[PDB]
Ligand binder design. Structure first.
Ligand SMILES: [Mg+2]
Ligand SMILES: [Mg+2]
Ligand SMILES: [Mg+2]
Ligand SMILES: [Mg+2]
Ligand SMILES: [Mg+2]
Ligand SMILES: [Mg+2]
Ligand SMILES: [Mg+2]
Ligand SMILES: [Mg+2]
Ligand SMILES: [Mg+2]
Ligand SMILES: [Mg+2]
Ligand SMILES: [Mg+2]
Ligand SMILES: [Mg+2]
Ligand SMILES: [Mg+2]
Ligand SMILES: [Mg+2]
Ligand SMILES: [Mg+2]
Ligand SMILES: [Mg+2]
Ligand SMILES: [Mg+2]
Ligand SMILES: [Mg+2]
Ligand SMILES: [Mg+2]
Lengths: 63, 384, 134
RNA sequence: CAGAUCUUGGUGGAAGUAGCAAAUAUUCAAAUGAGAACUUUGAAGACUGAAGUGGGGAAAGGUUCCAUGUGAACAGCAGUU
RNA sequence: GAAGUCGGCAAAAUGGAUCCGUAACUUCGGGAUAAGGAUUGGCUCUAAGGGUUGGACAACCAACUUAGAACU
RNA sequence: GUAGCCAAAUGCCUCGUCAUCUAACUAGUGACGCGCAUGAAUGGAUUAACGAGAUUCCCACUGUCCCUAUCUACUAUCUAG
RNA sequence: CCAAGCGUUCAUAGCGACGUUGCUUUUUGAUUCUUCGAUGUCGGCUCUUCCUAUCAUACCGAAGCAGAAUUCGGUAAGCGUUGGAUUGUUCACCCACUAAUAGGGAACGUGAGCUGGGUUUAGACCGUCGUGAGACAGGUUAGUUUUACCCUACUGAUGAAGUGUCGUCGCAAUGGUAAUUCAACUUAGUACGAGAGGAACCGUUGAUUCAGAUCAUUGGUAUUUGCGGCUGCCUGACAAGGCAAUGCCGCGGAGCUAUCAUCUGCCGGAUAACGGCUGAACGCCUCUAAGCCAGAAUCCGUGCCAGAAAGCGACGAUUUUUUGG
RNA sequence: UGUGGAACGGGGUAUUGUAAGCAGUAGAGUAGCCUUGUUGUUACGAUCUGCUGAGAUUAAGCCUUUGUUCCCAAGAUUUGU
């Protein structure tokens, strides 16, 4: 019972959450919800959206 | 020409609103006198749905020893109180209730069942009967003796402790629960001894048991034949609407046949669904209600934020696999199975690996308050 | 039928008249689904395929020799998300298949792009030529 | 006279039924009054948006114009208008 | 993705402007916006294109375009 | 019955025959022609451009369909008149 | 029915002439009994039900090692009987899938159900015909598809009480009823077979079609006008807003919803075909003569839905010191 | 008159995606004035950064609440072995 991490938001992915997308270049993406999946397909950079953890890690939010 | 099966089942007719809400046991399991005395049914309340992960033990299956995800239904089942007994005599016109014996004291919630306005009433429901019980205690024993001599079928009168749930309704639900087991005298003796006593869910059912669930389905109001019966949508060009049946009958019989789909009531109907498997009988007194041998986190069976439109489940519960009739908080009748089960699917012991307790009020990502606090760190409100 | 065993129900994504990429090097590019094997009887319902399903197809773009004829093919990728028994909903970027003979042996020799696990378990010839599976 | 899809007049069941749903939209307070969703005043919210729901004419009408009153009939709900 | 249907009926899609590019055929006029591509905000600048007017020149006033650059 | 033209909006037989397109076409197009009953200002043939004309197909597109679901306004509905 | 015969050999495994007895016809025809003060007209779509003359599914019988293939052969209509290219079509042929793609009836089922491709004779073109107006075993193109608000039926929705009242818990007459089919693997390279090859009952894991729910997950939906973004104009600017008949775009809880999602869908009795037992007549033989077994997806029940609003029971309290009981 | 109710408020749960305001030379640059500077003051400048996982919304068919403030001990009809 392993818990994945969203490829866009970085949040914990418990079983049954979101969808898995496997791209043509064999790269597998796990999305926690439709918002993360939709944003990813809108070519959005997760590092530019403040609420994600990639933005928080890069910008050292919360020290 | 171009055959197709008829739409819907003629076995579920008429599709009128059920004449009841509770959920009626139409047939109790066949009585075996060789077994000990036991109950055959229980009343619960639909709290909500979640999902689990468990390891499948099914040899020959591609998912054998692999993890599967399953939706489950949580039914809140606080102990019921036995308040009476009814004896039935076998007659050539069917079973007939010979007499009914009640406990000396009945709680307020069950006495509310005998009133439309309990508050405005004088609360005179069993007051003269109660005095009889404490005058000589001899008409009670005589009535019980008559059930022993006659009355091949014995059923206890049991009611729910609805005040222990978060429901706004204070009037308890009361039902006859057939007593199956050894000997009519032992049924009556068992029943008398349980007057004003609680019977809890684990004394009725057990882990991995296959049961039936009886309830009244979600109300839908009226529906046209397209959704009520599943008929094909008529073309876009159809003058005067397309959510109907094109031809509702031939010439001769010069009458609309009862087998033709018609618009009408589409919900609130009585259904008994068979073969629900008990995945867990939770205990309301232990703080690891939703913990497993693989998920040691101390958590109970209430999602974050509470069950939507229900609240917190603080009592005993059952975790049936799959779906059940009716909406959240409708009272549901759980019945012992009438069938015998020997299939591998029915007989496989069920051991849960993980129970989801994330919020069902949205795309919730934290199982517990502690997990949320750790992932996010601190917030503006948390510091001060 | 007689692939390696059985396949769970999967959300169908490719009805008849759907056109999917050819994922192999057989010379074809444009599989056009004509029928789906195992399809029973249901008025007005289109036969539809999922990953791992054998279909009948024609080639619309590619080598002139491959065209104008019905051949078997196996779906290996699909865009419609389906549900695995472990609760995961997954999908690919495109719809693709490979030309096979009735026994399930690949007409081509290489497969470009990922291949669904359901297709790989059922058809070992596809699994042999598959690169990354799922 | 029982008849003529008879003539003229009167009156039924269908029935308190079909319906009175195009043109964005009304609200608050006051006055008057037996009575105010519909009158008048103030306030708000809106619309026509200059090829106007604005300002005039030709044709046609003929007093419909104005003031003061009235409120049976008419204004397919109402009426102090 | 037309499998629907007699039939793409209805709907969808296209759409302004600027710069590229534009087949058969032709009565040589057309076809043609054929087809088929790219671009388009905001801000801060640069260049060029005209008039009144003081002793090769000129301090204002009165002006409107077009093209381009950087930043975002 | 010449030049032309054609199973043509003119061919009964007829779903003519061959070829092409399609997985598959009594469609369509191209050919063929003893043409029931084509044919020369009763105008024959061809034709760029134009056409809310008829017909076949391809791309785009899409709830036409697989297979239905959801939402808004006005009705229907209940009330007063 | 008849039996000359084919069927190396055996007239009726399977074929079977000449005759002869019947059924049906959805064929135009025949007739002219109903309708001309008017019964809307093909096909398709949709939807239900019925018949059996059985394509498939269940069980049985006969021919030859199995394996099969035929007689679907006998019962049997419970349950299925498809996606397309075409035909306006009916019919039909074609590509496929499928366990299988059986045939019919219901005013040639079905137009106040649609659609209007057919028919559709008003406009128009052609061929043949006609001196002409015009015509047609023809071809072509364009051509308004009205009304339920009545009775009944059907679908759902309330409901008076003389048999006390109002409740609670029940019974059950009667009506309805539901599941279906497939694949792979074990059996098993086994029974069987010179060899090649090659099963079956059962079991398991899945799947099709149907049925009843449900909304944890996933997907769709957006007046959550919830949050954010955008253009034009308007409130002097900022901020905050408004208008643009829901202005437009992203995400969007809740709800609703998806074979786009998930859950669940038995066993008892009597039989048919047909096969056995005890047993005769017709002193033997033989399933029948009486009887007893066995026996199908058949039928009837249990189970599931309704619950007689004029079928019924058990139980609770009985207008309160006014007045009624 | 009750472990009563309601209206608010608080906590939780969700959705969005970082509010207004103030500050910073962060900012393509540009123009005026000076002691003339690897922080030159000055003014304009889409935007950027920080306070700020902020702010807003959160039952309308979410959960919870010992918080606050109010409310109710009422009328009418019928029914008897
Ligand atoms: Mg119409
Ligand atoms: Mg939820
Ligand atoms: Mg169809
Ligand atoms: Mg008279
Ligand atoms: Mg007379
Ligand atoms: Mg008359
Ligand atoms: Mg009305
Ligand atoms: Mg306007
Ligand atoms: Mg305006
Ligand atoms: Mg004027
Ligand atoms: Mg496409
Ligand atoms: Mg078609
Ligand atoms: Mg079709
Ligand atoms: Mg159109
Ligand atoms: Mg031709
Ligand atoms: Mg001449
Ligand atoms: Mg109506
Ligand atoms: Mg019955
Ligand atoms: Mg305005």
């Amino acid at each position: 019972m392993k818990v994945e991490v969203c490829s866009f938001s970085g949040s914990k992915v418990y079983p049954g959450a979101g969808r898995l997308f496997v791209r043509g270049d064999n790269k597998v993406f796990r999305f926690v919800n439709k918002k993360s999946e939709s944003l990813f397909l809108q070519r959005k950079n997760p590092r530019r959206l403040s609420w994600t953890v990639l933005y928080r890690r890069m910008h050292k939010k919360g020290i | 020409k171009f055959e197709q099966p008829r739409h819907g089942s003629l076995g579920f007719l008429p599709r009128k609103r059920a004449s009841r809400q509770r959920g009626k046991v139409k047939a109790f399991p066949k009585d075996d006198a060789s077994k000990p005395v036991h109950l055959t049914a229980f009343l619960g309340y639909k709290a909500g749905m979640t999902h689990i992960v468990r390891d499948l033990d099914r040899p020959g299956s591609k998912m054998h020893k692999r993890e599967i995800l399953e939706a489950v239904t949580v039914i809140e089942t606080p102990p019921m109180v036995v308040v009476g007994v009814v004896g039935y005599v076998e007659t050539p016109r069917g079973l007939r209730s010979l007499t009914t014996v009640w406990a000396e004291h009945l709680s307020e919630e069950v006495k509310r069942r005998f009133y439309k306005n309990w508050f405005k009433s004088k609360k005179k429901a069993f007051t003269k009967y109660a005095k009889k019980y404490a005058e000589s205690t001899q008409s009670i024993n005589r009535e019980l003796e008559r059930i022993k001599k006659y009355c091949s079928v014995v059923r206890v009168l049991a009611h729910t402790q609805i005040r222990k749930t978060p429901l706004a309704q204070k009037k308890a639900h009361l039902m006859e629960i057939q007593v199956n087991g050894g000997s009519v005298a032992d049924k009556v003796e068992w029943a008398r001894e349980h007057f004003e006593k609680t019977v809890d869910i684990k004394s009725t059912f057990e882990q991995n048991e296959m049961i039936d669930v009886i309830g009244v389905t979600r109300g839908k109001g009226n529906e046209g034949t397209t959704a009520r019966w599943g008929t094909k949508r008529l073309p876009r060009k159809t003058h005067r609407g397309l959510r109907k049946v094109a031809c509702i009958g031939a010439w001769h019989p010069a009458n609309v046949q009862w087998t033709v789909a018609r618009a009408g009531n589409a919900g609130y109907m009585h259904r008994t669904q068979l073969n629900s498997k008990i995945y867990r009988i939770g205990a309301g007194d232990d703080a690891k209600n939703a913990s497993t041998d693989f998920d040691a986190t101390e958590k109970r069976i209430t999602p974050m934020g509470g069950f939507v439109r229900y609240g917190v489940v603080e009592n005993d519960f059952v975790m049936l696999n799959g779906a059940t009739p009716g909406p959240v908080k409708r009272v549901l009748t759980l019945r012992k199975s009438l069938l015998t089960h020997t299939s591998r699917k029915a007989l496989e012991p069920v051991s849960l690996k993980w129970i989801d307790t994330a919020s069902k009020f949205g795309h919730g990502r934290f199982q517990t308050p502690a997990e949320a606090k750790q992932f996010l760190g601190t917030l503006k409100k948390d510091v001060a | 039928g007689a692939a390696s065993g059985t396949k769970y129900r999967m959300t169908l994504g490719l009805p008849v008249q759907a056109i999917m990429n050819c994922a192999d090097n057989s010379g074809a590019k444009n599989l056009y689904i004509v029928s789906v094997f195992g399809t029973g009887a249901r008025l007005n319902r289109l036969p539809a395929a999922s990953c791992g399903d054998m279909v009948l197809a024609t080639v619309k773009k590619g080598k002139p020799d491959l065209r104008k004829k019905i051949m078997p093919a196996i779906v290996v990728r699909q865009r419609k998300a389906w549900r695995r028994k472990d609760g995961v909903y997954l999908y690919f970027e495109d719809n693709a298949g490979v030309i096979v003979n009735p026994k399930g042996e690949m007409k081509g020799s290489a497969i470009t792009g990922p291949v669904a696990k359901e297709c790989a378990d059922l058809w070992p010839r596809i699994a042999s030529n598959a690169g990354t599976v799922v």
